[PDB]
Amino acid sequence: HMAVKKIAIFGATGQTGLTTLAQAVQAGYEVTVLVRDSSRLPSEGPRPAHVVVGDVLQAADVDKTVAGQDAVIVLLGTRNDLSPTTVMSEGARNIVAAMKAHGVDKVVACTSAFLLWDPTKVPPRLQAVTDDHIRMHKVLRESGLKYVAVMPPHIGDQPLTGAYTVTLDGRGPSRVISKHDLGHFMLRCLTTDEYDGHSTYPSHQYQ
Amino acid sequence: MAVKKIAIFGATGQTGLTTLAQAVQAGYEVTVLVRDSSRLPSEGPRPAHVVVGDVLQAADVDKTVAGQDAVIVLLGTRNDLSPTTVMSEGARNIVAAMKAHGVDKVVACTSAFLLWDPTKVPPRLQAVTDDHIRMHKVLRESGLKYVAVMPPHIGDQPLTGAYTVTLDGRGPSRVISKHDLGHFMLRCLTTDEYDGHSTYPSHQYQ
Numbered sequence: 001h002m003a004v005k006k007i008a009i010f011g012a013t014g015q016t017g018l019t020t021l022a023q024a025v026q027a028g029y030e031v032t033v034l035v036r037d038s039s040r041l042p043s044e045g046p047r048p049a050h051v052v053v054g055d056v057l058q059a060a061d062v063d064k065t066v067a068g069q070d071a072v073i074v075l076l077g078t079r080n081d082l083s084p085t086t087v088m089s090e091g092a093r094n095i096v097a098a099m100k101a102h103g104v105d106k107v108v109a110c111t112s113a114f115l116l117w118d119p120t121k122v123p124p125r126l127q128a129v130t131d132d133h134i135r136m137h138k139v140l141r142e143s144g145l146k147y148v149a150v151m152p153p154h155i156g157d158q159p160l161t162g163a164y165t166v167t168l169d170g171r172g173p174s175r176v177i178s179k180h181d182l183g184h185f186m187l188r189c190l191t192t193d194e195y196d197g198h199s200t201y202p203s204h205q206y207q
Numbered sequence: 208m209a210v211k212k213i214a215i216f217g218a219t220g221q222t223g224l225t226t227l228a229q230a231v232q233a234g235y236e237v238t239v240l241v242r243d244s245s246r247l248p249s250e251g252p253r254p255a256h257v258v259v260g261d262v263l264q265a266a267d268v269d270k271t272v273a274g275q276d277a278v279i280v281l282l283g284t285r286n287d288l289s290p291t292t293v294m295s296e297g298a299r300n301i302v303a304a305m306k307a308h309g310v311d312k313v314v315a316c317t318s319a320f321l322l323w324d325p326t327k328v329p330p331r332l333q334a335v336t337d338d339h340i341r342m343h344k345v346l347r348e349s350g351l352k353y354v355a356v357m358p359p360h361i362g363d364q365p366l367t368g369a370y371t372v373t374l375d376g377r378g379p380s381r382v383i384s385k386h387d388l389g390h391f392m393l394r395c396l397t398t399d400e401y402d403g404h405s406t407y408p409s410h411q412y413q
């Protein structure tokens with residue numbers, strides 16, 4: 001028996017999402033993904049249990065993805081596009097509404113460690129994306145759901161270790177986390193309540 | 208010039224609720240225009256007068272503005288993604304009512320997007336921003352004493368009364384708590400120094 005077994009992953013086709021999905025399938029989760037029509041999961045990769053094709057900006061599609069889950073992981077982003085956007089915050093608004101309507105409480109959602117910085121220290125090139133992370137975090141904090149705010153520093157390509165530091169409610173001692181370790185942490189947050197209502201900063205020294 | 212009686216439009220919104228609470232605690236005699244009274248809190252500070260109606264209805268606006276010393280505007284649209292004229296049409300009704308009743312002072316919130324390049328606006332916020340621009344022009348062209356408040360991201364941090372106000376430009380911080388923003392709206396009732404200017408309240412919260 002698995003207490004948390006059915007999960008929705010938003011952003012499963014992305015850099016962190018692909019390894020989070022692979023790790024979740026290996027760990028025995030029954031994974032539902034929401035994918036945009038033109039960007040499905042790769043053919044040879046791990047297969048989720050359920051695929052909804054649609055858009056996080058459509059409440060109906062988010063409702064179809066959240067229905068019947070035990071928990072939600074959010075790895076939405078805009079790839080290498082740094083333009084002004086609201087896809088993460090509006091997506092989170094739809095996810096919150098769906099979770100409430102469907103009785104799902106646990107949401108583990110990735111924004112960024114810039115939400116623990118002096119705002120004057122965010123690089124201007126990243127300020128438009130960070131502004132939407134700030135909007136998204138406010139939506140999730142005000143929802144009343146069991147929300148783990150994951151606020152990573154630079155996401156790298158180093159290995160899965162499971163040995164990273166998790167700093168609560170502040171910046172940690174390294175400035176990198178591998179995408180594989182970030183995905184491992186998102187899944188770890190499904191199985192404990194200790195991070196609920198906190199900000200978390202995962203980081204590691206790869207050596 | 209002393210302001211005692213104010214109307215607040217948008218009193219049931221996130222900034223409106225704390226502006227209303229702060230105004231009642233400070234002694235203002237507050238009139239609000241609300242579409243649904245159940246959205247006002249049952250406990251604690253309550254306004255002195257409640258008009259049930261719509262800012263799009265000139266007669267409801269007229270009933271709200273009658274007898275006031277000043278008007279605070281904290282209108283906004285919920286989730287409008289595409290062209291909308293609620294705020295600017297509301298502002299037209301507010302202006303007409305202020306002129307008809309001899310009310311000379313209006314402090315109105317739009318957004319700091321009006322202080323930055325238009326390409327900084329997220330596409331899905333373009334329509335609300337376009338109507339903020341229309342509302343701002345309505346208020347500037349009215350000849351009324353108008354303080355334009357153009358806040359950045361509105362946060363949930365506790366009131367500080369310690370924020371910065373930048374005049375006709377942007378300040379060095381990118382968030383204002385809804386509570387500090389409401390405190391600033393009220394401060395604008397106690398002075399003429401911001402009239403005819405754009406104002407950018409911002410602060411660093413821890």
Ligand SMILES: NC(=O)c1ccc[n+]([C@@H]2O[C@H](COP(=O)([O-])OP(=O)(O)OC[C@H]3O[C@@H](n4cnc5c(N)ncnc54)[C@H](OP(=O)(O)O)[C@@H]3O)[C@@H](O)[C@H]2O)c1
Pocket residue numbers: 010011012013014015016017034035036039054055056057075076077078079080087088110111112113129152153154155156
């Ligand atoms: N160093 C870093 O790169 C760094 C550091 C800290 C924080 N962050 C933030 O961490 C988060 C995760 O980053 P990442 O690099 O893993 O993500 P990513 O590679 O940018 O992937 C973004 C995911 O979101 C999906 N998506 C975007 N718009 C969508 C929409 N309208 N509807 C449904 N799905 C949508 C994308 O799907 P498609 O396949 O359809 O595009 C993709 O699966 C991002 O928010 C990022 O800003 C990144």
Ligand SMILES: NC(=O)c1ccc[n+]([C@@H]2O[C@H](COP(=O)([O-])OP(=O)(O)OC[C@H]3O[C@@H](n4cnc5c(N)ncnc54)[C@H](OP(=O)(O)O)[C@@H]3O)[C@@H](O)[C@H]2O)c1
Pocket residue numbers: 216217218219220221222223240241242243246260261262263281282283284285293316317318319335358359360361362
């Ligand atoms: N969210 C941000 O960070 C941010 C940042 C900068 C600027 N702004 C802008 O700041 C202003 C205040 O924002 P806010 O978040 O505090 O507002 P909000 O929570 O969205 O509240 C909007 C207020 O306007 C009222 N309203 C809407 N349509 C009305 C109508 N036809 N007649 C009468 N009242 C009506 C609403 O009444 P109901 O309760 O009846 O709906 C509510 O009281 C907005 O114009 C917003 O666009 C927001």
Ligand SMILES: O=C(O)c1cc(/N=N/c2ccc(S(=O)(=O)Nc3ccccn3)cc2)ccc1O
Pocket residue numbers: 079080112113114126129152153154155171172173174175176
């Ligand atoms: O595309 C990107 O490169 C991108 C990057 C993003 N964030 N990158 C970050 C965010 C935070 C950091 S950080 O490592 O410098 N934070 C720190 C710094 C010092 C001490 C502790 N923590 C480093 C990189 C956020 C969105 C993005 O799109």
Ligand SMILES: O=C(O)c1cc(/N=N/c2ccc(S(=O)(=O)Nc3ccccn3)cc2)ccc1O
Pocket residue numbers: 086090131135283284285286287288318319320331332335358359360361381
């Ligand atoms: O820096 C910011 O985050 C910033 C944010 C601002 N946000 N303004 C708004 C205005 C309206 C809303 S809304 O929730 O009611 N409607 C919406 C929300 C998203 C997309 C389309 N419509 C949401 C945000 C406005 C100016 C800013 O500088």
